[PDB]
Amino acid sequence: GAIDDVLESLKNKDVKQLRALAPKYAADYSWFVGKLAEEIYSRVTPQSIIRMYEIVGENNQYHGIAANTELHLAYLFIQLACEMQWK
Amino acid sequence: GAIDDVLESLKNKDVKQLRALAPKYAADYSWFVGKLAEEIYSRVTPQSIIRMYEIVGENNQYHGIAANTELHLAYLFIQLACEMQWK
Amino acid sequence: MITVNEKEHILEQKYRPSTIDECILPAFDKETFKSITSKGKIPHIILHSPSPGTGKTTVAKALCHDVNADMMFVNGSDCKIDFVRGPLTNFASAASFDGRQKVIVIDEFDRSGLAESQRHLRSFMEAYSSNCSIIITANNIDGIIKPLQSRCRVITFGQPTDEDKIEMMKQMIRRLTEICKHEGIAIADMKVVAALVKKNFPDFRKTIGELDSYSSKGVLDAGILSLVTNDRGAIDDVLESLKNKDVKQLRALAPKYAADYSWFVGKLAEEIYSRVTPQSIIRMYEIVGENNQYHGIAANTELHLAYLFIQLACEMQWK
Amino acid sequence: MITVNEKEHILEQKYRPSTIDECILPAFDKETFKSITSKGKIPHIILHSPSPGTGKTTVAKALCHDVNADMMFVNGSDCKIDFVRGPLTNFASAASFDGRQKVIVIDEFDRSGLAESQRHLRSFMEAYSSNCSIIITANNIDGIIKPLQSRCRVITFGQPTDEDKIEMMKQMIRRLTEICKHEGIAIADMKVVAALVKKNFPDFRKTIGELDSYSSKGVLDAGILSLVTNDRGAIDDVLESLKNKDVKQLRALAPKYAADYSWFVGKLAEEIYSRVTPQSIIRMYEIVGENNQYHGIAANTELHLAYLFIQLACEMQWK
Amino acid sequence: MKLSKDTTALLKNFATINSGIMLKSGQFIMTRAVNGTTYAEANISDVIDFDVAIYDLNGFLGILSLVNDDAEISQSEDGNIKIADARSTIFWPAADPSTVVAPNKPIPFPVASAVTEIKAEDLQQLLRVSRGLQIDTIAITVKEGKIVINGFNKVEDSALTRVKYSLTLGDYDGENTFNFIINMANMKMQPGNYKLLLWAKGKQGAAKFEGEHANYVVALEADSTHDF
Amino acid sequence: MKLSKDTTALLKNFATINSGIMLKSGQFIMTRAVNGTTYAEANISDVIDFDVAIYDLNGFLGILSLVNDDAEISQSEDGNIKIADARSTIFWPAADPSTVVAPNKPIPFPVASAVTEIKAEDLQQLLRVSRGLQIDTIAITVKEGKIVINGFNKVEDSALTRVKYSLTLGDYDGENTFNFIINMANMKMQPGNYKLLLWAKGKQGAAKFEGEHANYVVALEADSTHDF
Amino acid sequence: MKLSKDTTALLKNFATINSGIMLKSGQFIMTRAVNGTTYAEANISDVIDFDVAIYDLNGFLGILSLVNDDAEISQSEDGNIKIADARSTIFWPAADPSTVVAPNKPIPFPVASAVTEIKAEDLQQLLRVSRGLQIDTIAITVKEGKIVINGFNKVEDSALTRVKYSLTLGDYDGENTFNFIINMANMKMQPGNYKLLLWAKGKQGAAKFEGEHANYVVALEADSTHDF
Amino acid sequence: MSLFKDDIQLNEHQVAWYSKDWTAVQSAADSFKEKAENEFFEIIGAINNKTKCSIAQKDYSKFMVENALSQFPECMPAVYAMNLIGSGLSDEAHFNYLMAAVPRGKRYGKWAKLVEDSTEVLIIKLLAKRYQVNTNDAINYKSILTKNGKLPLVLKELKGLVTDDFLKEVTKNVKEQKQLKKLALEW
Ligand SMILES: Nc1ncnc2c1ncn2[C@@H]1O[C@H](COP(=O)(O)OP(=O)(O)OP(O)(O)=S)[C@@H](O)[C@H]1O
Ligand SMILES: Nc1ncnc2c1ncn2[C@@H]1O[C@H](COP(=O)(O)OP(=O)(O)OP(O)(O)=S)[C@@H](O)[C@H]1O
Ligand SMILES: [Mg+2]
Numbered sequence A, B: 001g002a003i004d005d006v007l008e009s010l011k012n013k014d015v016k017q018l019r020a021l022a023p024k025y026a027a028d029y030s031w032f033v034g035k036l037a038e039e040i041y042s043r044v045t046p047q048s049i050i051r052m053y054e055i056v057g058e059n060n061q062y063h064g065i066a067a068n069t070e071l072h073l074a075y076l077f078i079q080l081a082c083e084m085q086w087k
Numbered sequence C, D: 001m002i003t004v005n006e007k008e009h010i011l012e013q014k015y016r017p018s019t020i021d022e023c024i025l026p027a028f029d030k031e032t033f034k035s036i037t038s039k040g041k042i043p044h045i046i047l048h049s050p051s052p053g054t055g056k057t058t059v060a061k062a063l064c065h066d067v068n069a070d071m072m073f074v075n076g077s078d079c080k081i082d083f084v085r086g087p088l089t090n091f092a093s094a095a096s097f098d099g100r101q102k103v104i105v106i107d108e109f110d111r112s113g114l115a116e117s118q119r120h121l122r123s124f125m126e127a128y129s130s131n132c133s134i135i136i137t138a139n140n141i142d143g144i145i146k147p148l149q150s151r152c153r154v155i156t157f158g159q160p161t162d163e164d165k166i167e168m169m170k171q172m173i174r175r176l177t178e179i180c181k182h183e184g185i186a187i188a189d190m191k192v193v194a195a196l197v198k199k200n201f202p203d204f205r206k207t208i209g210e211l212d213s214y215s216s217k218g219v220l221d222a223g224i225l226s227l228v229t230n231d232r233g234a235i236d237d238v239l240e241s242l243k244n245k246d247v248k249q250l251r252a253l254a255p256k257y258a259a260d261y262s263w264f265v266g267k268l269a270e271e272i273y274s275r276v277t278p279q280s281i282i283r284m285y286e287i288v289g290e291n292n293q294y295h296g297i298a299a300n301t302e303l304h305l306a307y308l309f310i311q312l313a314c315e316m317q318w319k
Numbered sequence E, F, G: 001m002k003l004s005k006d007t008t009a010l011l012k013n014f015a016t017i018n019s020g021i022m023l024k025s026g027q028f029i030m031t032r033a034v035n036g037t038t039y040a041e042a043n044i045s046d047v048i049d050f051d052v053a054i055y056d057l058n059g060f061l062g063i064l065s066l067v068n069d070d071a072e073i074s075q076s077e078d079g080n081i082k083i084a085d086a087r088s089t090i091f092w093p094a095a096d097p098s099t100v101v102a103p104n105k106p107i108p109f110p111v112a113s114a115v116t117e118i119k120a121e122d123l124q125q126l127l128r129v130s131r132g133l134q135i136d137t138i139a140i141t142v143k144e145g146k147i148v149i150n151g152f153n154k155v156e157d158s159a160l161t162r163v164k165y166s167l168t169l170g171d172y173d174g175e176n177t178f179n180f181i182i183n184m185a186n187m188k189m190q191p192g193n194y195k196l197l198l199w200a201k202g203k204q205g206a207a208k209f210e211g212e213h214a215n216y217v218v219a220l221e222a223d224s225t226h227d228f
Numbered sequence H: 001m002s003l004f005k006d007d008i009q010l011n012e013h014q015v016a017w018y019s020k021d022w023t024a025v026q027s028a029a030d031s032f033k034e035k036a037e038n039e040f041f042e043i044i045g046a047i048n049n050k051t052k053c054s055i056a057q058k059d060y061s062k063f064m065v066e067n068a069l070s071q072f073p074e075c076m077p078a079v080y081a082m083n084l085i086g087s088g089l090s091d092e093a094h095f096n097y098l099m100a101a102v103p104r105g106k107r108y109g110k111w112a113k114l115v116e117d118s119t120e121v122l123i124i125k126l127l128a129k130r131y132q133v134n135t136n137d138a139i140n141y142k143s144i145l146t147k148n149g150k151l152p153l154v155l156k157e158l159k160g161l162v163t164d165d166f167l168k169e170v171t172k173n174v175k176e177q178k179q180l181k182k183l184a185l186e187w
């Protein structure tokens, strides 16, 4: 799969691309979530590493019960973008 | 397939109508949540789009473990009505 | 003339009209029901009634019995996703070769938490309409989704006329006398039965329930007229206790409404909304939404509801 | 005069004491055990050792050997209901044609699920009380049901009395030196043995285990022997990682334990209990319970463990 | 009655379908499962001479086995079954008809839409494999002009597309193509040369196995697709 | 000693009464239930040449079955039983005599107040029905000048008023009336023809089943009368 | 293949040894316990003409016994085994070889340190007694110039000093003292006349049973003492 | 009635063990089972007034403890948290959290009531299931039967429909077997 597009979108803090690409990952959630959690660590502020991990872990926690998976990924994307300590 | 009534009532900020019409739009929750997100994004100020994302994402992620889905949707409607402005 | 199951100890499910004729109904409603039963078929019907208690569940069961159909009595509460896709589908598909029609009576298919159950039943009825007929039974019609209304023909109870009112009152007084005689209960005064029936005429389930509750004394004393009772749909006890902030009673009352949490939270958000300050309406929705949100991750729903009660009592501004 | 088992791959079992005399203990407890053995008949006894590692299994086996009793050692966790009904009864109802008292030594009997077996063994003691004597060993006396303490005589011996403390300090140092000499490890550092004795003194089992661990490479007996330890622990590595707040290790090891989260989560709760503070313990239990509730709801189950670790590290104020 | 060994075996087999049986005054014993999925019937040589509803047919048959073959059953003075013998006398409680679920009238199975035949050995093999191979659903479809009793696992193969067992019963000469999905829990027929004659109409279908001793009418699952 | 198949079968049957049997030198084997309600005795064809107590008779006989009939059972050096086969030697642990309840002396049964007979088939059918019907107790009563064993389910009806099973043994020559009650848990007699001869003086009674091999004695429950 | 009765019995025994097996092309079937304690191998008269790794050998044999003896077992399109009877056609999955533990190649047994013969009756008696006497460990040491198998109950006494059952195999020729301890849970050999070839070097040893059809190899317990 | 006039007493444990009456042995062993009242009293005393009580052999019931501690709003937040997340926690962990959260007090449990009050929801549930009425009508029927109809008389027959599958909806756990025996004898 591709994760560079989502990471760059988070870096530039776009909002249209996140929504557009969210349905492209909703088909398989766990794989994409794990991959994103792995990649984001190498490009996050040491203090913001904990925040990113907590956000991704909470979202992973509440999947399965989420009514709309695609909106579930979208919400993840805005949550990451709004308060990501990019380094 | 059309949710213009929900958007109009939310803009008017009439909590009675939102709750009244929630039962009929609560049969399908994933689709309605997606549609509400899209129309609110297209019809809301840039600052409040993040607030809408947080509200709708929380409310849909907690779905499935919601005892009364109609009350859940009414809660979403009230949260959106009293917590966001409209462009 | 009066049917008796003899296996029910409730006196309300024991003496219940087994046939449509035995039911005390207005002339117009009884004639329409007789026509439906004489047609030999039971089209999908949403039995309706403005005044609760006029005997609509009993009328549906009487229709099914008169047609001789293989009635499948199912409550609206338990008509969930799997039930619609499971036992209901098995009953509708499995074809017994006795020639008996299949009818699925669905009580109270208008409660709060039944948003999606109605749509799923609509889909099922669309799939299995030709085999089994669905007889809904709702108090308020608007509680039934609009698409489901078109499929089944709606019938409305109530609206008794003056002559109909007098005839029904006399019939129910005679039925009460017969029931008391059959149950070994001595009525002190004949006028007592007439007064009791007049107190709540439009609905007879309430009258039968009051008589059953009073039967402890064994005599229909004049004190039965003093039994105010309480509307079944209403939750006024919870609201009064919340206003008084008596957590000692809210905890002991939580188990009563914890059996059906979804409907109760719906009713609470519906009613507590019109008797609290507008500033506290937002907080009420926050609390009820958060409590509803977590039901499903909560092991015991009674403690969930008790916590919700204490929170509402301590954080509610009552207007 | 150290008794070497000569048939085990572990020093602790290799050099376990063979008698009460060669067992080094507080003077009062050793005198009590000597009197017990001198009386000839070993009664029911519960060996209570509040301080872990002091050695209660060794004392029970030493009593049984010293009194010549026909010991039948059974591990407490292995003393299930079926074991009591089977092998225990078979042993207690066997003709003792040698004059040796039959003594059952149920070791570490204060476990979690050992209740239906503890009261069952109490009934057993009621039946075969004149055939076999039971010597139960429990770390937590509160973990042995009340009847088993009312029948058996509870004995506690983990409290050195100052001067007895120093006497047994010298005794343990001499015994460790002799065991090292017999094993084939030279005492390179004289201060190292005393330092290791002091570091965990009433943990003789742990000290012997560490001596075995550090003696494998060579004679050594200096340096890391008295300097900290090297025990990895089942979850001790993760506990240390969380304490240090390191994030790389947590994510690295999350997939290792993600295979069986339930056992790991339970063990993590059990271990972190002892290293936290009341507010910290409340928060830790909330975190672990919340995370476990969503095991079947987690998207993958490895990022879930990572999130649990991050939460604990951020919130867990270790003490 | 007499309830000869053959009738006792038939009733013992029936007890599998329904825990209790409502016997009637005649040479015809019939039973149906509580959920109604499976119906069983057969003409018993022994003559039943009183309407007695037995709540525990398995226990009644077990007691009857320990008695002489010529154990003259009879109605007791209290109203229960009295299994009289040469010397002994066993009394069994004849439960009321309300608590015993039995069909009101014999099932008049319509003209078979697709008649077939299942050999005794084939049926025995089909049951043993289902027990041991995890099969819990069989679809009596048509494949290359031959009727094949496929076998699936509805628990795991929700779509019922991965066949676990196949059994070519025979060749179908008709043009209609059908996939009759019969649950395995409803395949309670006793061993024997059966002649299953299927029937389907719209969303309602049935499959009837007509042996030389008893006839078993099973209800096709909800997913049975066909073009009749 | 040597334990023939007959003696081993008799001991195996006894093992159902008392889990362990205190064998004694001679030709007499006797065992009593720990409750004391059941007693069994028999004259074996073998010769027990040493007094040994076995706490697990079922296991001992299971071991004896494996070794050939030639196997010679001899007391071991340490008192344990030692079944010595032709090529394999088995050591069995002799129980502690305290932990094996055995009678001190044989129960000498007085002259029977009423003497009857029970056929082997009748007794086997009674034992099987007891399990089938849940017959907790029985009663050797007289009905119309005959001896009848009426079985009752004491757990359900405590007054012992409903006979769930009635067995007629024979005509009672005497003229006394009695309601001897024998619990089914104490009916451990092996299959065969038994000349049961009852006896009850005052409030204490006992029923003895004088068989060809063993002579079981059963304690009559407290509700038996035989008032004469 | 066309697995016959004897090959199926051998594979059932191996499934007893190992929950699953890994068939390989040719005429050789071998399996090893999950923990490697016991290794079993045997030559068969049927040709395994394709490599499959059945994860549940016992269930596969159970399903195979439900068809004709000439069931032309083969491999399906997905690689899963496809038993094909005259009419039926079972489908048994072939698990990935990684999941099923199997030996890399046939175990080459060192020269026979000692040779002894254990008869079929003696072996069956040993197994049955071990099940009965609670024996769980057997020592094959030599006593008074003869090789005997002693049964020790480790649970009651870890020190193997109290012997529960002694079996004399045959005369011992060598002049070496050895006491090999073989766990009884590793004696999965099928009944027959075996040809024990004991072997042990230093602290590691292994005993092989040269069976008529199979060659079972068991790993001696570490507690074994000897002069090898 | 003890054919033999043995002087050996066989004190109700020798009879159970020597005779290998494993049912009798189990009954004798349970004869040492502390009645649930004092076990629960000790557990709730340790939780409510901080005390050194350890549950290793005690039959610790999460539901009983929670619904006996929820009678007091002071310790409701702790009961609520352990209701939401307690499921899945080890009984020892649940007890430790309750010990650390429940502030203090005495609270006078009154175990005699919370045992019956804990079955009220089950009674309502199966009474609405048997009569096919909503839970409000179920509680109405329960109240009516308490006075007239002899609620125990109804429950006698109602016990037959408390299926192992039905109890799953009442509560989600494996300890629900407690009310299986509780309603296995309702008379
Ligand atoms: N028209 C009627 N004639 C005779 N009995 C009646 C009639 N209506 C109700 N009842 C009695 O009421 C009971 C059953 O009435 P129901 O139809 O179940 O009440 P209901 O219509 O369901 O009230 P709601 O709307 O559900 S609260 C029985 O005891 C009947 O005897
Ligand atoms: N007082 C002691 N004197 C001599 N050796 C001891 C003593 N205490 C422990 N040991 C040693 O500890 C080993 C055996 O420890 P045990 O007490 O039998 O094990 P244990 O059951 O874990 O005891 P714990 O951990 O205190 S509950 C042997 O190597 C003994 O030599
Ligand atoms: Mg109604």
Ligand SMILES: [Mg+2]
Pocket (backbone or CB within 6 Å): D056, D057, D107, D108, D137
């Ligand atoms: Mg220990």
